[PDB]
């Protein structure tokens, strides 16, 4: 019974389509021709459904999946109903522990390839040949919230990449800021407990605006640098496609000759850097808590594949101690003005998973999963991470055989003497389960280290010191990097940082904690400190006003690569505009609008006061994607109002509020013909305002203007005009 | 180190205080003198902290909890650091699986007492004497979202109560609507999978506005009754304190003479019935996703204990077949006009937990946990529940000894021959682990059924029929209960139902699903169907326009007890009002305002454009609780603006928007003296309007008028006026 619509509209077309054009679908059904070695290797466990009989897990066909077995139709359920019990038992045991941190995340499949061979600095196989492609699986995430929390919270974001190389799995488990909050892994449980929901009542969920977080920060000044990044607009990215990625720690690259080079890993977003504004981000956690997850999935379904460039900061071994900060301190960044990022390769995410639980939820990343050609360093945060990931996956994934869960399996050979464990899939035929053995002629065998396909050998770093629980004295500087970050931001970025601290500390109930945090800000920069204090009704003391600013970082008074917006990097492909329809749209305006958006790869969403269709002035039937309230301005990058019967929507509260919200949030707005009467609602300018595109009709020049604004992301010059608007 | 402020302001006073006045805290520290038998029995496992040395879990004192052990202060971390490894190991394994459904929930401790002995209808010990107090632990929840999802989503809410009786634990596991979506437990996994996030991409999180839910609903008309309740304002309660509770199924009461009486369980909120409006609820999931958890905790800390009256609908065994519907069908309600609710007792929730994870997350409720004096029925949804909760707790709580986790332990004696299992706490000394035995003289021993303290014996219900997987023909009626619900709602409640369906179906991407749901609505009520269709741009066919409405339910064409608001039951105690300050408030207005609110137990929050303090006209220093943006109008019940230097905030966008938002969401607003200048912000006429209180000062009847409006909850007559308003 209950069947598909006659017309076949239940099923999405298996071709690239813009967001909202078709229902989303499992990756293998949406893009069956998109393949890679890892995607193909998962074919053994993919399960179809069309034309198959419904069965139990033991393969018994079910005749009635609507009713339990009972003694009479109004009688008691019987214990012998094994079909009911198997179905309910499986349902009852669907959940597994969420990740302790980074539980909220969104993932996709893709591939990587180097631009040229890097064999002179590393023997890693995946970086040895420009035409050797390596499948990847990437998961982006937030830190604090649970798996069911919201996407556009203010938080550091995780950026984890699993490379399925020919010499083993390499996991590059990074975040979207170049430093971490703490120096030693021993404090991780303390820091995480402080940022997570407070233990008595389990509030608040995915935001750091609460007493315990700011108490920890105020008592542990090493956290200030990453706190500065979190309070900036870096903490509220527009998309996972428009943020940077960093490995944070200094690692080593080892070449065939045995030479070690220190390296820091970077990902550069080829769509550019872009973030939301706080009010927008917070409201969007309510209007669409799945915004980043959705946006990633739809970009891949549209062909707007997330693309990132891998880059390396390289420091010779002999230059380990030449900076004014320790290279092994994860609260310190290496300014690009001192050590440039060398481009290494490109990563493209081009296919969504088939099943979120099987592939995203069960994926296991670990920074200890390195390969020959790579090695660790003594960074005390990284050292502790090496223990933790393996340990947590034993309980999260139910045993030691988590590498046999399909998404986690290597695509290269794996053979050893490990056996058994819960849910053991591999059936070993080796007569031996130990080495050395004579009974299988000692196979599988050890392999000496070498230039290629060699066994792993650690770099023989010299270790000299007593067994101590002590922080290196070189790590005891906490204010210069925060200050370098502060001075590198534009004026509007600085304002947003001030507003971030002010908002968060206004939610701290104990006033002395707010004062202690302001005291720490006074050791970074007095202008920043005074601006936050003023918003909290706090007065800096005379001593606070006389704190000497921290020294410059190796002579730098600023580094523009630390700003999101100082150096233009805008890219409109993949962005989306809202088009507010009316019941008699001028089709000539629409035609020109859609053509210009199409030429730059910008999507459109047609909105109205109701769902269904509206008919343009030439008879074209226009399906409505959503209502004005249903897809708020928060979800788009710009708003366009075509001419037609403007009287239809001129007095619509939601239509007017749509423009007020977009205006407040600094988005470009374009008004054609009679749509220019909406200028009154955003109560500003009569001769026009930079940021507002207006003309008698939507034409080539009107669209060029709008698209130029869109490439600059937001209208920062409108900032002074928005705090009067009631929106 | 000694980091607390010397003034002791880090610690909350151990006395009842209003929301926001002090930092919240663990229940036993906030209210040490609030006790009950269960709370006292948990003293064996409560752990303090003050004045104790920091140790490992083995009791070894720790000297340096800031650093890992390494070879040299910049060297590698050593494997012999057992302190680091224990600390990180425990952190790595903190999470357990969340509940499969109702994962998001908030709980508190309390007590229950019957008004009079019910010995004539039940032998249940907890209902046998008015002076018998039974400790309870209650958990309120949503259904779909994860543990980290938001509170004010549109969903059915769970209302689960664990009664720690002298004859065993009784768990009454109910919801906030009197029926469930489905009829047979065999479809529970299907219904739940349809409402939960879609499997390819895991979206959307806590809202049912997506294709698979409405696909299922459109193909299974049995769901329409509970869907009607979810689309009404019942799906968005103001607080867990202001919603009703129901057991849903017909159970049995058994008295000492062996007579069975059918019973349906009800909880009546002594604070009244109250819900939010959709736009407010959805925006509140972003501004404060923990609103209901917070509100419950703060109500209890303030002394505004959540109070509920337990009531029974009783039906004699001989009247089983006297209704138009089957008593065993969980998609059908029993109209109070046909069978009144008899008041049974009162439950008061008066203490929060100490540790959310230990007490709330690990609590295990199960409808199969009944006691002598109660029994089950053949309702086919209830029958399947009896299997599922035991099964799911084995994996959720790590084994069969979950009854030994402190919160789940009975307060009465428990002795049997069950042994071992993971995490076994009890050390059995019985020589025997089986019965019958002679080696311990057969103890513990079976106990015959009797009037008091007897063994459990099932009611000897006659069973007759063949073994079949078949729905009773008596359950095959799906539209009369939905229609009865619809006709019992006020006109504004009907509009909100129409708006709920309209918004939800507008998020369904496949248009045919929207059409099929509209067709089902046409079988319930033509006005409802036409209004939803209009909002979707769908036209009803002539056939749909002629579908004959379903019959009345036992001659009823409405039952006012199904409405939230048809019969006023307003209670102002525990509500909160925002007070928008200026930099020279008229102290006289503020004195009058705050004392009037205090006299009725209404809380206040003093808001401004920054934190700190403001000084009134007479020099009174006024502490600011939050900024206008920090504590939006969504979080309060009414807004008051006192006179003073109104020019200070008159052009503040946030202050004006605060009133626009409150106005749109139908909240009472009161403006004193020059604060009447804000009338132009919300377009109020010079002569005024119902729902807006205004006078020259806050004296006289100004506060009485505002409190009268608060008692009516919202200003329903303003609906037509908010239609426009750009907010
Ligand atoms: C530079 C500092 C760090 C970065 C960049 C980082 C990054 C991440 C990321 C991106 C994830 C999520 C991976 C996924 O998507 O599944 C994650 C998970 C995790 N992190 Fe780290 N983290 C850092 C520090 C630490 C430390 C110091 C510890 C403990 C010593 C730690 C313990 C964990 C654990 C236990 C998980 C859960 C993994 C799982 O369940 O599979 N992290 N981290
Ligand atoms: C009248 C219909 C139902 C009502 C009123 C109801 C109510 C609830 C409530 C309030 C909870 C949360 C208890 C807590 O706070 O921990 C819950 C959890 C649960 N429900 Fe039910 N439910 C119903 C139907 C069902 C059915 C038909 C099944 C399966 C056959 C089911 C399976 C579960 C499971 C497995 C849990 C999680 C329990 C745990 O993990 O401890 N429910 N339900």
Parse chain B into domains and list their residue ranges. 25-410, 470-573, 574-727
Torsion of CA B656, B661, B665, B670, to 10 degrees: -20
CB atoms within 10 A of CB B464: 8
Catalytic residue among B175, B176, B360, B582: B175
CB atoms within 10 A of CB B426: 12
Q: CA A467, A468, A469, A475 torsion: positive or negative?
A: negative
Contacts of B669 (CB under 8 A, 6+ apart): B638, B639, B640, B641, B659, B662, B663, B682, B691, B692, B693
Query: Which of these, A699, A642, A649, lies nearest to A673 by C-alpha position?
Result: A642
Query: B252 CB less than 6 Å from ligand 2?
Result: no
Phi and psi at residue B421, in whole multiples of 5°?
Answer: 85, 155
Query: In this structure, which residue's CA is closest to atom 24 in ligand 2?
Result: B385
Chain A residues inside the 8 Å CB shell of B612: 536-538
Q: Helices A700-711 and A587-599 meet at what angle, rounded to 10? A: 40
| C-alpha count within 13 angstroms, C-beta hemisphere, residue B127 | 23
H or E element at residue B374? strand B374-375
Distance CA B696, CA B686 (A): 13
Of all residues in chain B, the one with the smallest CA distance to A19 is: B509
**Given resolution (angstroms):** 1.6
Longest CA–CA span in chain A (Å) reads 91
Query: Which of these, A422, A442, A440, lies nearest to A431 by C-alpha position?
Result: A440
Per-residue DSSP letter, A676: G
Cis peptide before B9 (omega within 30 of 0): no
Give the number of the ligand closest to the Cα of residue B402: 2
Query: In this structure, which residue's CA is closest to atom 30 in ligand 1?
Result: A385
Chain B residues inside the 8 Å CB shell of A726: 653, 656-657, 660, 681, 727
First to last CA, chain B: 51
Distance CA A386, CA A367 (A): 7
A645 is catalytic: no
Query: B389 CB less than 6 Å from ligand 2?
Result: yes
The answer to the question of whether A164 is labelled as a binding residue is no
Contacts of A598 (CB under 8 A, 6+ apart): none
* Distance between Cα B362 and ligand 2 center (Å): 15
Chosen for mutation from A185, A202, A656 (greatest number of chain B CBs closer than 10 Å) is A202
Give the number of the ligand closest to the Cα of residue B380: 2
CB atoms within 10 A of CB B430: 15
CA B99 to ligand 2: nearest atom: 40
- Cβ–Cβ of A150/B150 closer than 8 Å? yes
- Cβ–Cβ of B22/A473 closer than 8 Å? no
Q: CA B695, B700, B705, B711 torsion: positive or negative?
A: positive
CA A45 to chain centre: 28
Distance CA A130, CA A117 (A): 6
Mutation probe of ligand 2 site: the residue of B99, B106, B393, B399 with most atoms within 8 A of C-beta? B99
Lookup result for tokens 């089709």: A587
Query: B388 CB less than 6 Å from ligand 2?
Result: yes
- Cβ–Cβ of A470/B67 closer than 8 Å? yes
Q: CA A712, A717, A723 angle in degrees (round to 5)?
A: 125
SS3 content of chain B, % helix, strand, coil (to 5): 30, 15, 50
> Over the range B377-404, which residues count as b (16 or more CB within 10 Å of their CB) and which as e?
bbbbbbbbbbbbbeebbbbbbbebbbbb
Contacts of A282 (CB under 8 A, 6+ apart): A152, A154, B286, B287
Cis peptide before B296 (omega within 30 of 0): no
CATH 1.20.1370.20 fits A470-573, yes or no: yes
Contact A251, A263 (CB under 8 A): yes
Per-residue DSSP letter, B358: I
Question: Could you tell me the CA-to-CA distances from B245 to A702, B308, B660 in Å, in that order?
Answer: 58, 9, 34
Q: What is B25-410's CATH topology?
A: Catalase HpII,  Chain A, domain 1 (2.40.180)
A:B CB pairs within 8 Å: 445
Chosen for mutation from B3, B22, B68, B86 (greatest number of chain A CBs closer than 10 Å) is B68
CB atoms within 10 A of CB B245: 28
Contact B635, B291 (CB under 8 A): yes
Give the number of the ligand closest to the Cα of residue A359: 1
Query: In this structure, which residue's CA is closest to atom 42 in ligand 2?
Result: B385
Query: Which of these, A551, A508, A514, A509, lies nearest to A529 by C-alpha position?
Result: A514
Q: CA B113, B117, B121, B126 torsion: positive or negative?
A: positive
Q: Where are the alpha helices (DSSP H) in B610-652?
A: 647-650
Contact A183, A475 (CB under 8 A): yes
H or E element at residue B693? strand B692-695
Contacts of B558 (CB under 8 A, 6+ apart): B484, B487, B488
Distance CA A500, CA A506 (A): 10
Q: What is the CA radius of gyration of chain B?
A: 28
- Cβ–Cβ of B200/A353 closer than 8 Å? yes
Q: CA B488, B492, B493 angle in degrees (round to 5)?
A: 45
CA A387 to ligand 1: nearest atom: 30
Peptide-bond breaks in chain B following residues (C–N over 2.5 A): none
Query: B396 CB less than 6 Å from ligand 2?
Result: yes
Give the number of the ligand closest to the Cα of residue A365: 1
Q: Helices A491-506 and A511-521 meet at what angle, rounded to 10? A: 160
Query: Which of these, A265, A62, A89, lies nearest to A171 by C-alpha position?
Result: A265
> Over the range A113-151, which residues count as b (16 or more CB within 10 Å of their CB) and which as e?
bbeeebbebbbbbbbbeeeeebbbbbbbbbbbbbbbbbb
Chain B residues inside the 8 Å CB shell of A198: 24
Longest CA–CA span in chain B (Å) reads 92
* Distance between Cα B385 and ligand 2 center (Å): 7
Q: Do domains A470-573 and A574-727 have the same CATH topology?
A: no
Chain B residues inside the 8 Å CB shell of A294: 201, 203
| C-alpha count within 13 angstroms, C-beta hemisphere, residue B35 | 7
* Distance between Cα A247 and ligand 1 center (Å): 11
Distance CA A225, CA A273 (A): 20
Q: What is the DSSP string of A75-110?
A: SPBPTT-HHHHHHHHHHHT---PPPSS--SEEEEEE
Query: Which of these, A686, A673, A475, lies nearest to A592 by C-alpha position?
Result: A673
- Residues contacting ligand 1 via CB (< 6 Å): A 99-102, 105, 139, 141, 158, 160, 173-175, 180, 185, 188, 248-249, 330, 363-365, 381, 384-385, 388-389, 392-393, 396; B 88, 92
Contact A379, A329 (CB under 8 A): yes
Q: CA B354, B355, B360, B362 torsion: positive or negative?
A: negative
Distance CA B168, CA B413 (A): 8
Chain A residues inside the 8 Å CB shell of B358: none
Alpha-carbon distance B154 to nearest alpha carbon in chain A (angstroms): 12
Query: Which of these, A226, A194, A225, A199, lies nearest to A211 by C-alpha position?
Result: A194
Give the number of the ligand closest to the Cα of residue A176: 1
Catalytic residue among B36, B102, B176, B369: B102
Q: What is the 3-state secondary structure (H, E, C) of B431-495?
A: CCCCCCCCCCCCCCCCCCCCCCCCCCCCCCCCCCCCEECCCCHHHCCCCHHHHHHHHHCCHHHHH
Of all residues in chain A, the one with the smallest CA distance to B210 is: A23
Chain B residues inside the 8 Å CB shell of A287: 282-283, 286
* Distance between Cα A562 and ligand 1 center (Å): 24
DSSP β-ladder status, A603-608 and A576-580? parallel
CB atoms within 10 A of CB B32: 10
A175 is catalytic: yes
Dig out the tokens for B21 from the structure: 């006045």
Q: Where are the alpha helices (DSSP H) in A18-81?
A: 27-30, 37-41
List residues forming the annotated binding site of B: 389
Contacts of B168 (CB under 8 A, 6+ apart): B369, B371, B372, B410, B412
Mutation probe of ligand 2 site: the residue of B389, B395, B398 with most atoms within 8 A of C-beta? B389
Contacts of B420 (CB under 8 A, 6+ apart): none
Q: CA A235, A238, A244 angle in degrees (round to 5)?
A: 65
Distance CA A600, CA A605 (A): 15
Q: CA B701, B707, B710, B712 torsion: positive or negative?
A: negative
Query: Which of these, A415, A609, A89, A1, lies nearest to B394 by C-alpha position?
Result: A89
Phi and psi at residue A138, in whole multiples of 5°?
Answer: -120, 140
Query: In this structure, which residue's CA is closest to atom 2 in ligand 2?
Result: B180
Q: Which of B188, B536, B726 sits opposite A653 (nearest CB)?
A: B726
- Cβ–Cβ of A611/B352 closer than 8 Å? no
* Distance between Cα A347 and ligand 1 center (Å): 22
CATH class of A574-727: alpha beta
- DSSP reduced 3-state for B694: strand
CB atoms within 10 A of CB A422: 11
CA B162 to chain centre: 15
Chain B residues inside the 8 Å CB shell of A151: none
* Distance between Cα B101 and ligand 2 center (Å): 7
Q: What is the DSSP string of A257-323?
A: T--EEEEEEEEEETT---B--HHHHHHHHHH-TTHHHHHHHHHHHHT---EEEEEEEEEEGGGTT-S
Q: Which of B88, B200, B467 sits opposite A78 (nearest CB)?
A: B467
Chain B residues inside the 8 Å CB shell of A2: 219
Q: Which of A67, A84, A536 sits opposite B611 (nearest CB)?
A: A536
């Amino acid at each position: 019974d209950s069947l598909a619509p006659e017309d076949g509209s239940h099923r999405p077309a298996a071709e690239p389509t813009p967001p909202g054009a078709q229902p989303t679908a499992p990756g293998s059904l949406k893009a069956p021709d998109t393949r890679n070695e890892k995607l193909n290797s998962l074919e053994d466990v993919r399960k179809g459904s069309e034309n198959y009989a419904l069965t139990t897990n033991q393969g018994v066909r079910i005749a009635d999946d609507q009713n339990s077995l009972r003694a009479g139709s109004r009688g008691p359920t019987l214990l012998e109903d094994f079909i009911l019990r198997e179905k309910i038992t499986h349902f009852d045991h669907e959940r597994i522990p969420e990740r302790i941190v980074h539980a909220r995340g969104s993932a996709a499949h893709g591939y990587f390839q180097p631009y040229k061979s890097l064999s002179d600095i590393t023997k890693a196989d995946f970086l040895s040949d420009p035409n050797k492609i390596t499948p990847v699986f990437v998961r982006f995430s937030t830190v604090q919230g649970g798996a069911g929390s919201a996407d556009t919270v203010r938080q550091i974001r995780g950026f984890a990449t699993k490379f399925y190389t020919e010499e083993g799995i390499f996991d590059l488990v990074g975040n979207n800021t170049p430093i971490f909050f703490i120096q030693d892994a021993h404090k991780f449980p303390d820091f995480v407990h402080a940022v997570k929901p407070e233990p008595h009542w389990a509030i608040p969920q995915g935001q750091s605006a609460h007493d315990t977080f700011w108490d920890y920060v105020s008592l542990q000044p090493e956290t200030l640098h990453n706190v500065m990044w979190a309070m900036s607009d870096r903490g509220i990215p527009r998309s996972y496609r428009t943020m940077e990625g960093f490995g944070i720690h200094t690692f080593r690259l080892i070449n065939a000759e045995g030479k070690a080079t220190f390296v820091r890993f970077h990902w550069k977003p080829l769509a550019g850097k872009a973030s939301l504004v706080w009010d927008e981000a917070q409201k969007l956690t309510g209007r669409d808590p799945d915004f980043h997850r959705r946006e990633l999935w739809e970009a891949i379904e549209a062909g707007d594949f997330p693309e990132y460039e891998l880059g390396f900061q390289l420091i010779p071994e002999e230059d380990e101690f030449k900076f004014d900060f320790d290279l092994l301190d994860p609260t310190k960044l290496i300014p690009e003005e001192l050590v440039p990022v060398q481009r290494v390769g490109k990563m493209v995410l081009n296919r969504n998973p088939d099943n979120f639980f099987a592939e995203n939820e069960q994926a296991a990343f670990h920074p200890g999963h390195i390969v020959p050609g790579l090695d660790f360093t003594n960074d005390p945060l990284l050292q502790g991470r090496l223990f933790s990931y393996t340990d947590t996956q034993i309980s999260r994934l139910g045993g030691p055989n988590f590498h046999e869960i399909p998404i986690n399996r290597p695509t290269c050979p794996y053979h050893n003497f490990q056996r058994d464990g819960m849910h053991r899939m591999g059936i070993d035929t080796n007569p031996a389960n130990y080495e050395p053995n004579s009974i299988n002629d000692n196979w599988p065998r050890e392999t000496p280290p070498g230039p290629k396909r060699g066994g792993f050998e650690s770099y023989q770093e010299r270790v000299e010191g007593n067994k101590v629980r002590e922080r290196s004295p070189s790590f005891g500087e906490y204010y210069s990097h925060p200050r370098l970050f502060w001075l590198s931001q534009t004026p509007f970025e600085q304002r947003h940082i001030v507003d971030g601290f002010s908002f968060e500390l206004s939610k701290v109930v104990r006033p002395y904690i707010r004062e202690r945090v302001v005291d720490q800000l006074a050791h970074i920069d007095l202008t920043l400190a005074q601006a936050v204090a003023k918003n909290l009704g706090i007065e800096l003391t005379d001593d606070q006003l006389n704190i000497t600013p921290p020294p410059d970082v190796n002579g730098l008074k600023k580094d523009p690569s630390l700003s999101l917006y100082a150096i233009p990097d805008g890219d409109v492909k993949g962005r989306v505009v809202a088009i507010l329809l009316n019941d008699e749209v001028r089709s000539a305006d629409l035609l020109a609008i859609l053509k210009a958006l199409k030429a730059k790869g910008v999507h459109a969403k047609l909105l109205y006061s109701r769902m269904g269709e509206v008919t343009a002035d030439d008879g074209t039937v226009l399906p409505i994607a959503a209502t004005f309230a249903g897809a708020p301005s928060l979800t788009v990058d710009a708003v366009i109002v075509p001419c037609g019967n403007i009287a239809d929507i001129a007095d619509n509260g939601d239509a007017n509020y749509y423009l007020m919200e977009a205006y407040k949030h600094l988005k470009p707005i374009a008004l054609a013909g009679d749509a220019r009467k909406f200028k009154a609602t955003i109560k500003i300018a009569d001769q026009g305002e930079e940021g507002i595109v207006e003309a008698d009709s939507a034409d080539g020049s009107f669209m060029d203007e709008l698209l130029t604004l869109m490439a600059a992301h937001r209208v920062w010059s409108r900032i002074p005009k928005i705090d009067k608007i009631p929106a």
